[PDB]
Amino acid sequence: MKSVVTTVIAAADAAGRFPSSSDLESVQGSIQRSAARLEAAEKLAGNIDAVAQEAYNACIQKYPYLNNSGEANSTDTFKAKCLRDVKHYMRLIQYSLVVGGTGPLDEWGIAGQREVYRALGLPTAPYVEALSFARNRGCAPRDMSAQALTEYNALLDYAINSLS
Amino acid sequence: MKSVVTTVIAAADAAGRFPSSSDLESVQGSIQRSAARLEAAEKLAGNIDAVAQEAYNACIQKYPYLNNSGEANSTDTFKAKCLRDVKHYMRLIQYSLVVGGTGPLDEWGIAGQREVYRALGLPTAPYVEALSFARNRGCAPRDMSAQALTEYNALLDYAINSLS
Amino acid sequence: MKSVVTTVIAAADAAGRFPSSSDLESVQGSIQRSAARLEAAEKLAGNIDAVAQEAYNACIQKYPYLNNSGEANSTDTFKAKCLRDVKHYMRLIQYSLVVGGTGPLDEWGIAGQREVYRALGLPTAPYVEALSFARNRGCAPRDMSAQALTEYNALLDYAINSLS
Amino acid sequence: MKSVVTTVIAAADAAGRFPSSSDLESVQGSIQRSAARLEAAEKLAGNIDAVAQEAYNACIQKYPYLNNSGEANSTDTFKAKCLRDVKHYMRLIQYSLVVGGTGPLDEWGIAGQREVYRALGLPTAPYVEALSFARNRGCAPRDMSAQALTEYNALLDYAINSLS
Amino acid sequence: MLDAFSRAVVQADASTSVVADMGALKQFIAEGNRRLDAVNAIASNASCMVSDAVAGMICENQGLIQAGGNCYPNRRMAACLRDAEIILRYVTYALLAGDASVLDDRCLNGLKETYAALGVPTTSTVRAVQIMKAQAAAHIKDTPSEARAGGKLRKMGSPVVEDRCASLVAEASSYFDRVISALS
Amino acid sequence: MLDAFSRAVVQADASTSVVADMGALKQFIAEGNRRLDAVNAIASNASCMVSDAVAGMICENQGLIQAGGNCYPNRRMAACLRDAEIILRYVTYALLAGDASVLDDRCLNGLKETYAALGVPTTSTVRAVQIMKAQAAAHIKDTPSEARAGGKLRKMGSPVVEDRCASLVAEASSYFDRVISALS
Amino acid sequence: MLDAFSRAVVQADASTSVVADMGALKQFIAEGNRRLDAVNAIASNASCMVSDAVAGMICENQGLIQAGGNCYPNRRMAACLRDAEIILRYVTYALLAGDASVLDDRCLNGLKETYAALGVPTTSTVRAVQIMKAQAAAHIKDTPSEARAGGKLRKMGSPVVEDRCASLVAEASSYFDRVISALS
Amino acid sequence: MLDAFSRAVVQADASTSVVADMGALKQFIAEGNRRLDAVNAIASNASCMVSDAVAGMICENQGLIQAGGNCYPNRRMAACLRDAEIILRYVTYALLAGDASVLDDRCLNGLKETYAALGVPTTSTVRAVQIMKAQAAAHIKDTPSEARAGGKLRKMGSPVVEDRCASLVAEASSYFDRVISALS
Ligand SMILES: *C(=C)C1=C(C)[C@@H](Cc2[nH]c(/C=C3N=C(/C=C4\NC(=O)[C@H](C)[C@H]4[C@@H](*)C)C(C)=C\3CCC(=O)O)c(CCC(=O)O)c2C)NC1=O
Ligand SMILES: *C(=C)C1=C(C)[C@@H](Cc2[nH]c(/C=C3N=C(/C=C4\NC(=O)[C@H](C)[C@H]4[C@@H](*)C)C(C)=C\3CCC(=O)O)c(CCC(=O)O)c2C)NC1=O
Ligand SMILES: *C(=C)C1=C(C)[C@@H](Cc2[nH]c(/C=C3N=C(/C=C4\NC(=O)[C@H](C)[C@H]4[C@@H](*)C)C(C)=C\3CCC(=O)O)c(CCC(=O)O)c2C)NC1=O
Ligand SMILES: *C(=C)C1=C(C)[C@@H](Cc2[nH]c(/C=C3N=C(/C=C4\NC(=O)[C@H](C)[C@H]4[C@@H](*)C)C(C)=C\3CCC(=O)O)c(CCC(=O)O)c2C)NC1=O
Ligand SMILES: *[C@@H](C)[C@H]1/C(=C/C2=NC(=C\c3[nH]c(C[C@H]4NC(=O)C(C=C)=C4C)c(C)c3CCC(=O)O)/C(CCC(=O)O)=C2C)NC(=O)[C@@H]1C
Ligand SMILES: *[C@@H](C)[C@H]1/C(=C/C2=NC(=C\c3[nH]c(C[C@H]4NC(=O)C(C=C)=C4C)c(C)c3CCC(=O)O)/C(CCC(=O)O)=C2C)NC(=O)[C@@H]1C
Ligand SMILES: *[C@@H](C)[C@H]1/C(=C/C2=NC(=C\c3[nH]c(C[C@H]4NC(=O)C(C=C)=C4C)c(C)c3CCC(=O)O)/C(CCC(=O)O)=C2C)NC(=O)[C@@H]1C
Ligand SMILES: *[C@@H](C)[C@H]1/C(=C/C2=NC(=C\c3[nH]c(C[C@H]4NC(=O)C(C=C)=C4C)c(C)c3CCC(=O)O)/C(CCC(=O)O)=C2C)NC(=O)[C@@H]1C
Ligand SMILES: *[C@H](C)[C@H]1/C(=C/C2=NC(=C\c3[nH]c(C[C@H]4NC(=O)C(C=C)=C4C)c(C)c3CCC(=O)O)/C(CCC(=O)O)=C2C)NC(=O)[C@@H]1C
Ligand SMILES: *[C@H](C)[C@H]1/C(=C/C2=NC(=C\c3[nH]c(C[C@H]4NC(=O)C(C=C)=C4C)c(C)c3CCC(=O)O)/C(CCC(=O)O)=C2C)NC(=O)[C@@H]1C
Ligand SMILES: *[C@H](C)[C@H]1/C(=C/C2=NC(=C\c3[nH]c(C[C@H]4NC(=O)C(C=C)=C4C)c(C)c3CCC(=O)O)/C(CCC(=O)O)=C2C)NC(=O)[C@@H]1C
Ligand SMILES: *[C@H](C)[C@H]1/C(=C/C2=NC(=C\c3[nH]c(C[C@H]4NC(=O)C(C=C)=C4C)c(C)c3CCC(=O)O)/C(CCC(=O)O)=C2C)NC(=O)[C@@H]1C
Ligand SMILES: *[C@H](C)[C@H]1/C(=C/C2=NC(=C\c3[nH]c(C[C@H]4NC(=O)C(C=C)=C4C)c(C)c3CCC(=O)O)/C(CCC(=O)O)=C2C)NC(=O)[C@@H]1C
Ligand SMILES: *[C@H](C)[C@H]1/C(=C/C2=NC(=C\c3[nH]c(C[C@H]4NC(=O)C(C=C)=C4C)c(C)c3CCC(=O)O)/C(CCC(=O)O)=C2C)NC(=O)[C@@H]1C
């Protein structure tokens, strides 16, 4: 699963090398940057329900047609699952903040997402809008430090990019 | 040439990836660690002749047989190349400190060194002794900061290990 | 294991061939050349201890520093192993003379030798010198026939080259 | 082209080896066996027309049907080419005797022979009978020495086996 | 590949000498966080940049999406979108490294020749890259306009300085210009 | 492979929950510089550790270098030195990452079966690993002795604390013990 | 693979001792020309031997070419002819080398199991090998009968001695017998 | 590849005629033992030859081992030492076969072009080959000087004749001359 340390270990292993100067350096970066992304991970851990709720609310208000008969937000089950999905993405983002690399998002969210929503006739735009809302929503210093917000937004953009 | 940034770029490119979270974190480590290794790289650039001179002297003091007729330190030309060699290694170490990766040492010193020395009948013990002396020589804060000395010493040990 | 006959068998098998003209001719070579190399093999069989002892003595004579503290001929265990190593090579040469190919020396002596000596910090010059002494030592017909001596010296030069 | 020396050279080159003891030994074999196979080679060189004429005669006597209308020995052009074919094989055998390997026969006679005769509706039995005649025809010491006849017959059987 | 520091090392080795002038390198380190923000600015908006740039190239030349056009049919449009992203990806690598070598060796070497054999129109390619260059500049400056972005406007929220990273803007632009030079 | 942080994320994902207990991980960060020193301490001394551990394994069991012994002839001694370096290298990965998964997945998995097929003797393999375990502990504590090291003694010169990184020493030893268990 | 001489060396290396007994190997050389003749006697007649052996296996067990038989259809008959020649070829390798290892390593190892998976009757295979064993003996002795040869009779013309290479015949036979042992 | 004998065969096949004059070829056999000594002389001293010749090329041209030099840094020197041995190896092949075809086919063909692309200096390559040609001649004659050899002097101990195998010396030098011609 991709992070600062797994990447350099994997590179070192491919050449049969002990960890060397650049590997140790790279990990120092994880030490330095950890404060900002763990701040974001902690804010998200504590408030994930409300954060996911308003992102979900945003995509439904952008696409009211989803509530129509036969559409992806039209039943109590569909509604629950849509909100659940948004929360899944936020949770994987929380994970990617903790780990400091896109691994959790890559492996448990992005991989296969396009086949799944195609097979199920789920449009991708509401997913994009939910994430896009969440990306535009935060401001610093209100919600978290400016650098924590940068970490948070970067993962949101990463997710958005994967659907775009 | 292996460094913090080329390692993560190579890894990203292999996977068709834009720079992401763990790539930027890695480069932040190079920012943080650079003060220590550039301190050493400066201390070395400004005194390499003296540092290489006493290392060379030490390997000859350790192995007087090198002075005997037909041995690798017996002629004036031979003496000059051995010292030149000791200075080569220290200069590639200086490069490696600047870069913050073993790339320069790897490509321009270590690659092919075994085949060269075995071809020419050049014993590797005096190479190792000269580097070993330099590795044991430094102390902090006298010569440089403890962290700069750490960077210096790690590349010396990296070169020693390539010969051992 | 490489000999005259295993070489031609291996080539015939790669092409799915029965032994043919050139394969039988090759083995006729073994028949002719066997007397000389087996002569050397018997002399080596009967006198390997004395042959090895004097070749070992010569390399220590060339490099007295090996007796110094921390050097490779400096203790009783070290001295006994060095002589043993010299005897190993002569025995493998004895084997190669019997087989009539470098097989035994390739597989059990040369393969891995550089890695072993590097790891243990054992200089390669005394090995070369012990083998070089043995190479220059024999004369014919005192020690064996001229053609037996040719076969003997050829395997010593083969081992010397593998270390050079 | 396969001979004693090109076989061991190919093998050495595959392993990046200088010529070693078993290579030289193999070549001593070709030296030793050369007298026998060159005796055969000279006999065949000086009498190839007669050797081939009687072998061609033999196969046609064995298979009179070939003279019948529409068969392989029925016209003057056909009769000419069949004798010519027998002579081709005898010349490649002569080549192989000089070389001391089946190379010439392999490359210039056998390779493609089955495809050619299939395409042209040429029966192989007449080829085999002509060669079989030649194989049984000779006796030592009348025609050549016993070992020279061995060398001769061996290449004939080789050619016979390639069609059988 | 090389980076800004291994580049200096390569030039220092050319005269078998130490690296003594650490001037431009201290400055490189000093601008490190900026550089990271600049890369983040491009990477984070990469999909929007590529689709907008290729769309821009097309709205300026409708021939591209008509019969015989190099963005027709679907497969060609897809290939073109892919290529734009590839080029932008290598430009971001060059920016992260502070050296063009990765862009030159892995992307641009031989690209002109590849494109000429395929019949990929150089003039339209240049235009796509030109638009990406203008996008990158604005995102690095964190001054994208609502006019060009519409509903998809993104603000990076990096710490503001008066020249808005002019040095890094010129550098990114220089990498885009290498692409255009190689495809010219 | 996992690291200390993705390990925690895996455990959280087992109940599809956010990672909330960040105590052990903020602690992992707090001891990050220590961990880099510990890895530097092993990597810097790895050649000396491997040759000394294999030499140790042998001086305690002369069977290995006599006829039929598994460090005989030269080829086998070389393969053994290689394996000792490989095992130590994967242990240093585990320590850098803070998680045994790279070691389990890329080195230990299937190794016992491999060794059993070849006839590589477990008793001696375990002993070499045991010596490397003791070496590592001493180098991490930066208390290697002149007695075992002789002229090759190395001092790391890291900032001293009273416990001398006892936690990292125990963790390092746990990875070596995983090798031993796997080979057992 | 090994030959007669490297076999002696491997046995000597097992006790890390010089090769002292070179009598059996001196006799190998002394009978070298004979050995070359014996290999020549099989190789030269291999095609006749293989076809006559498989034809004999079949004429003794017609089930092989009737419905469901393992030499039916053409593809299976051809595969069988191929196999008989392969076995004969590796036997001639063994005879030229004076050691079975090339036969064991590259032909017989895993063969019984291969035939089991396929349903190739090992018993009929044994019979073809038995016939080839008998053929080889007579060609080595240079005493093939006209009864078994017909118009395909070949005479080798080797220098005759009373025992007619009894030891080599026995050795050749032992190799065929190894094949038969391996398929039983 | 061809040898002395198959070369003659190839020339005969051109006029589809038998090989009639075995004069040069009976001569080849007669000198066969000399040829084997000559190949032994070169193979047995190959390492000394290669190192002495590359070091000679270098001591005559210091530019090779200074910045920009083609034997700088360690990697290039190693590549050069390798190439010198490769060329010597293929020359010994040609000498053993008595035909240049293995040298031409497998080594020389395409080599001038490869070195040109690499910037491997032909003038230095030629000098290294020149010294090896000089070495081979002395070794084949068994007359190396202590001057050029020092402590590494080797005497082959072959049966001496007046011309000291003048024919083979000329043949050997003609192979070295082919290499030089191929590059120049
Ligand atoms: C066809 C009708 C047509 C177009 C399509 C469009 C193409 C175009 N776009 C630009 C400039 C920019 N585009 C930008 C893209 C984005 N900004 C964002 O915030 C999101 C993340 C992203 C996707 C929409 C940006 C940042 C710019 C820079 C200018 C700006 O004001 O922001 C151009 C101008 C390029 C140039 O100067 O040469 C063009 C032509 N225009 C069309 O006519
Ligand atoms: C054979 C007679 C024989 C040995 C060889 C030796 C093997 C051995 N080594 C140790 C312990 C260590 N070895 C270390 C290695 C090094 N120290 C250094 O400073 C350099 C860089 C490097 C190479 C020499 C280290 C650090 C140790 C740790 C202990 C210490 O330093 O005192 C052991 C002991 C194993 C244990 O303690 O469980 C053994 C057996 N001993 C032999 O008998
Ligand atoms: C089916 C009805 C049937 C057969 C077909 C035949 C098979 C068979 N053959 C032998 C013995 C030999 N065959 C030999 C082959 C040849 N001799 C030659 O000269 C040419 C080159 C070659 C091809 C024809 C040889 C040499 C022998 C040895 C005996 C001999 O007298 O020569 C056997 C007997 C095998 C045994 O003894 O177990 C059999 C069964 N027989 C059939 O019934
Ligand atoms: C640099 C200052 C410098 C050199 C290095 C050296 C290079 C050189 N060597 C020769 C000639 C020979 N070298 C030989 C090599 C060997 N002889 C041996 O006995 C051992 C086994 C082996 C390695 C030492 C041989 C046999 C020769 C042939 C001449 C002779 O033996 O006397 C030359 C001369 C090449 C020529 O004639 O063009 C050179 C330049 N010389 C240096 O100046
Ligand atoms: C041009 C690119 C921008 C701009 C950039 C600036 N960024 C500045 C500081 C800064 N940026 C970061 C984030 C960066 N560092 C990282 O380690 C990572 C990811 C791992 C990223 C994305 C940090 C941590 C900092 C330092 C703390 C801070 O300043 O808040 C910055 C100020 C420093 C300087 O002057 O170089 C600038 C100017 N500013 C602009 O105006 C345009 C839009
Ligand atoms: C147990 C392993 C050691 C020990 C280690 C300590 N190191 C401490 C601080 C420290 N170490 C480094 C170097 C490290 N950081 C890097 O970025 C890199 C490479 C890129 C390396 C090798 C730094 C920079 C620091 C902080 C500065 C300083 O303290 O000088 C340390 C103190 C902090 C802490 O308590 O965790 C310790 C204890 N100390 C020991 O006693 C044993 C021998
Ligand atoms: C049982 C195998 C035979 C038999 C064999 C004998 N052959 C004898 C001598 C001999 N054979 C060859 C040919 C061989 N040497 C080669 O170099 C090559 C091809 C490269 C081949 C095929 C030669 C040259 C010689 C020596 C000359 C001669 O003696 O005529 C031989 C006599 C020596 C001995 O007793 O070992 C025997 C017995 N003879 C038999 O009785 C059966 C049929
Ligand atoms: C120029 C090359 C030399 C030289 C060579 C001569 N060698 C002569 C005879 C000879 N050499 C060998 C060894 C060779 N034959 C082999 O089978 C093998 C290995 C398989 C090798 C290395 C033998 C067996 C013989 C024949 C027996 C003998 O003469 O002792 C030789 C004399 C024969 C002839 O004149 O052609 C010469 C001249 N002699 C020289 O003067 C330079 C140094
Ligand atoms: C900067 C002043 C912005 C701005 C910010 C406002 N946000 C408001 C409410 C709000 N925001 C979030 C998302 C935020 N909470 C989190 O836990 C995380 C990340 C983990 C983020 C990004 C939530 C869940 C809420 C509701 C709960 C709360 O009050 O914090 C807000 C209140 C009014 C409103 O709801 O719109 C403001 C003013 N608003 C702006 O206009 C500037 C640009
Ligand atoms: C620390 C208390 C040590 C110790 C240190 C001493 N070093 C002395 C002289 C010296 N050291 C070096 C190597 C140093 N110079 C460099 O430029 C670099 C790295 C680039 C290093 C590591 C040099 C070149 C010199 C001579 C010039 C000078 O004095 O600075 C020294 C003076 C006496 C002497 O030469 O030994 C001391 C005391 N000595 C110790 O015993 C503790 C362990
Ligand atoms: C030719 C006359 C030489 C020469 C030869 C001398 N050798 C002497 C002793 C000696 N040589 C060996 C090696 C030899 N014995 C073997 O078993 C084998 C190979 C299996 C070889 C090559 C040994 C072991 C010994 C000591 C026992 C013995 O005497 O045989 C010798 C006696 C005096 C001395 O030790 O030097 C001579 C004269 N000496 C020459 O000057 C020419 C060139
Ligand atoms: C004689 C025993 C045959 C027979 C033979 C015929 N062969 C005919 C054509 C032909 N033959 C060969 C093989 C020959 N050419 C070579 O180059 C070599 C080896 C170097 C050999 C053995 C070839 C390639 C060809 C086709 C090209 C050509 O016309 O030469 C032939 C003419 C048949 C036709 O034109 O359809 C005949 C009659 N005829 C017999 O009765 C017995 C079976
Ligand atoms: C003939 C005496 C048998 C018989 C033989 C069949 N074998 C069939 C397939 C087969 N045979 C082998 C072994 C062969 N290949 C090798 O590489 C080596 C040694 C290096 C040997 C001995 C293999 C591996 C295979 C399977 C792959 C293949 O078809 O080549 C076969 C075809 C089986 C089928 O397709 O049903 C037959 C008929 N069958 C007989 O009845 C007699 C006893
Ligand atoms: C030494 C006498 C020269 C010299 C040689 C260099 N050659 C370099 C690279 C190189 N050489 C070859 C030819 C070699 N490889 C083969 O396979 C064969 C024949 C079978 C031969 C003769 C190749 C193909 C290559 C490229 C691939 C590689 O590096 O192995 C080289 C390195 C050049 C570079 O990478 O910059 C050197 C230095 N150079 C000298 O200065 C003297 C004259």
Mind giving me the DSSP string for D68-129?
STTSTTSSHHHHHHHHHHHHHHHHHHHHHHHHTSSHHHIIIIITTHHHHHHHHT--HHHHHH
Q: List chain D residues with CB under 8 Å of C16.
A: none
Among C110, C113, C120, beta carbon nearest to F51: C120
Distance CA A130, CA A135 (A): 9
Tell me the CA end-to-end span of chain D in Å, nearest whole number.
23
Q: Is chain D adjacent to chain G, meaning 3+ CB pairs within 8 angstroms?
A: yes
At residue C69, φ and ψ (nearest 5 deg) are -50, 130
DSSP H or E stretch at residue D157: helix D146-162
Cis amide prior to H73 (ω within 30 degrees): yes
Distance CA G5, CA F72 (A): 21
The identity of residue D40, as a single letter, is A
According to DSSP, residue A3 is labeled S
Helix axes H166-183, H111-118, angle to 10 degrees: 50
**Residue H157 in contact with residue C140, Cβ under 8 Å?**
yes
- Comparing CA positions, the residue from G134, G155, G143, G119 lying closest to residue G52 is G134
**Residue H30 in contact with residue D52, Cβ under 8 Å?**
no
Q: Give the list of residues 6+ apart from residue H48 with CB closer than 8 angstroms, or none.
A: C164, H149, H152, H154
Binding site membership of G173 for ligand 3 (Cβ less than 6 Å): no
- Comparing CA positions, the residue from B82, B94, B21 lying closest to residue B56 is B82
Say how many Å lie between the CA of residue G165 and the centre of ligand 7.
10
Distance CA D104, CA E23 (A): 72
Place of tokens 């030069």: C157
H31: left (phi over 0), alpha (psi -120 to 50) or beta: alpha
Contacts by F54-58 with C-beta closer than 8 Å and gap 24+? F54/C119, F54/F80, F54/F81, F54/F84, F54/F128, F55/C120, F56/F127, F56/F128, F56/F131, F57/F124, F57/F127, F57/F128, F57/F131
B5 close contact with F: CB closer than 8 A: no
Binding site membership of E20 for ligand 5 (Cβ less than 6 Å): no
Tell me the CA end-to-end span of chain E in Å, nearest whole number.
24
The burial class, CB within 10 Å (0-12 / 13-18 / 19+), for E106 is middle
Distance CA F32, CA C118 (A): 34
CATH class held by domain B1-164: mainly alpha
- Comparing CA positions, the residue from E157, B24, B28 lying closest to residue A143 is E157
SS (H, E, C) B11-62: HHHHCCCCCCHHHHHHHHHHHHHHHHHHHHHHHHHCCHHHHHHHHHHHHHHH
Say how many Å lie between the CA of residue D123 and the centre of ligand 12.
10
Alpha helices in H110-150 (DSSP H): 111-118, 122-140, 146-149
Query: What angle is formed at CA E74 by the lines to CA E70 and CA E77, rounded to 5 degrees?
Result: 45
- Within 10 angstroms of residue C70's Cβ, the number of other Cβ atoms is 12
Helix axes A21-62, B4-14, angle to 10 degrees: 50
Cis amide prior to B141 (ω within 30 degrees): yes
**Residue B33 in contact with residue A25, Cβ under 8 Å?**
yes
Q: List chain F residues with CB under 8 Å of G15.
A: 67
User: Tokens standing for B81?
Assistant: 């190349």
- Comparing CA positions, the residue from F118, F133, F117, F119 lying closest to residue F181 is F133
Among C9, C17, C99, beta carbon nearest to G9: C99
Distance CA H72, CA H57 (A): 14
At residue A70, φ and ψ (nearest 5 deg) are 85, -5
**Residue A31 in contact with residue F29, Cβ under 8 Å?**
yes
Q: Give the list of residues 6+ apart from residue D9 with CB closer than 8 angstroms, or none.
A: D19, D23, H1, H93, H96, H97, H102
Residue B102 in 3-state DSSP?
A: coil
Characterize E121-148 residue by residue with b for buried, 16 or more Cβ atoms within 10 angstroms of its Cβ, and e for exposed: beebbbbbbbbbbbbbbbbbbbebeeee
- Pick the atom of ligand 14 nearest to H121's CA: 43
Q: How close G56 comes to chain C (CA, Å)?
A: 22
User: Tokens standing for F129?
Assistant: 């690993």
**What are the Cα distances from residue F92, in Å, to A12, A20, A24, A123, F37?**
11, 11, 12, 47, 12
Asked if G14 lies within 8 A of F67 by C-beta distance, the reply is: yes
At residue B21, φ and ψ (nearest 5 deg) are -30, -60
User: Tokens standing for D84?
Assistant: 């010519």
User: Tokens standing for D124?
Assistant: 């192989």
Place of tokens 């430009």: E91
Domain region containing G139: 1-184
**Residue C32 in contact with residue G29, Cβ under 8 Å?**
no
Q: Is chain F adjacent to chain A, meaning 3+ CB pairs within 8 angstroms?
A: yes
Mind giving me the DSSP string for F83-96?
HHHHHHHHHHHHHH
**What are the Cα distances from residue D3, in Å, to C8, D94, D104, E101, F101?**
11, 14, 9, 52, 56
**Residue A89 in contact with residue A160, Cβ under 8 Å?**
no
Tell me the CA end-to-end span of chain F in Å, nearest whole number.
24
Domain count across chain F:
1
User: Tokens standing for C77?
Assistant: 């265990």
Q: Give the list of residues 6+ apart from residue A35 with CB closer than 8 angstroms, or none.
A: A147
C35 close contact with D: CB closer than 8 A: no
**What are the Cα distances from residue E156, in Å, to B138, C126, E41, G176?**
46, 68, 7, 82
Distance CA C95, CA C106 (A): 11
User: Tokens standing for C78?
Assistant: 């070290």
Handedness of CA B101, B104, B106, B110 (dihedral sign): negative
Touching subunits for chain A (3+ Cβ pairs under 8 A): B, E, F
**Residue C98 in contact with residue G19, Cβ under 8 Å?**
yes
**Residue D91 in contact with residue H18, Cβ under 8 Å?**
yes
Mind giving me the DSSP string for chain E?
---HHHHHHHHHHTTT------HHHHHHHHTHHHHHHHHHHHHTTHHHHHHHHHHHHHHH-GGGGSTT-TT-SHHHHHHHHHHHHHHHHHHHHHHHHTSTHHHIIIIITTHHHHHHHHT--HHHHHHHHHHHHHHHHHHHHT---HHHHGGG-----PPP-TT-SHHHHHHHHHHHHHHHHHT-
- Comparing CA positions, the residue from G4, G52, G182 lying closest to residue G106 is G182
Characterize G20-52 residue by residue with b for buried, 16 or more Cβ atoms within 10 angstroms of its Cβ, and e for exposed: eebeebeebbebbbbbbbbbbbbbbbbbbbbeb
According to DSSP, residue G157 is labeled -
The number of C-beta contacts closer than 8 angstroms across B and E is 97
Residue H72 in 3-state DSSP?
A: coil
Distance CA H106, CA H100 (A): 10
Residue of B nearest to E4 (CA): B99
Distance CA E42, CA E36 (A): 10
Q: List chain H residues with CB under 8 Å of C160.
A: 47
Determine the residue among B102, B157, B162 to mutate to test chain F binding: the one whose Cβ has the most chain F Cβ atoms within 10 Å.
B157
Residue of G nearest to F65 (CA): G16
Say how many Å lie between the CA of residue H93 and the centre of ligand 8.
18
Distance CA H43, CA C162 (A): 12
At residue E88, φ and ψ (nearest 5 deg) are -60, -40
- Please give the distance of CA B68 from its chain centroid, rounded to a whole number: 28
Distance CA E140, CA H8 (A): 76
Characterize H52-82 residue by residue with b for buried, 16 or more Cβ atoms within 10 angstroms of its Cβ, and e for exposed: bbbebbbeebeebbeeebbbbbbbbbbbbbe
The residue count of chain B comes to: 164
Distance CA F58, CA F61 (A): 5
Domain parsing of chain D, residue ranges: 1-164
Helix axes F4-13, A76-99, angle to 10 degrees: 160
- Pick the atom of ligand 7 nearest to G165's CA: 1
**Residue E106 in contact with residue E89, Cβ under 8 Å?**
no
**Residue G16 in contact with residue C91, Cβ under 8 Å?**
yes
The burial class, CB within 10 Å (0-12 / 13-18 / 19+), for C86 is buried
User: Tokens standing for E97?
Assistant: 């490294």
- Please give the distance of CA G19 from its chain centroid, rounded to a whole number: 30
- Pick the atom of ligand 4 nearest to H55's CA: 5
**Residue C101 in contact with residue C71, Cβ under 8 Å?**
no
Method: X-ray
Residue F44 in 3-state DSSP?
A: helix
SS (H, E, C) H84-111: HHHHHHHHHHHHHHCCCHHHHHHHHCCH
User: Tokens standing for F56?
Assistant: 């140790």
**CATH code of residue E19:** 1.10.490.20
The identity of residue H142, as a single letter, is D
Handedness of CA G123, G125, G128, G133 (dihedral sign): negative
Q: Give the list of residues 6+ apart from residue D79 with CB closer than 8 angstroms, or none.
A: D73
- Comparing CA positions, the residue from B95, B96, B85, B75 lying closest to residue B131 is B85
Q: Whose CA is nearest to atom 8 of ligand 13?
A: G79
**Residue C104 in contact with residue C28, Cβ under 8 Å?**
no
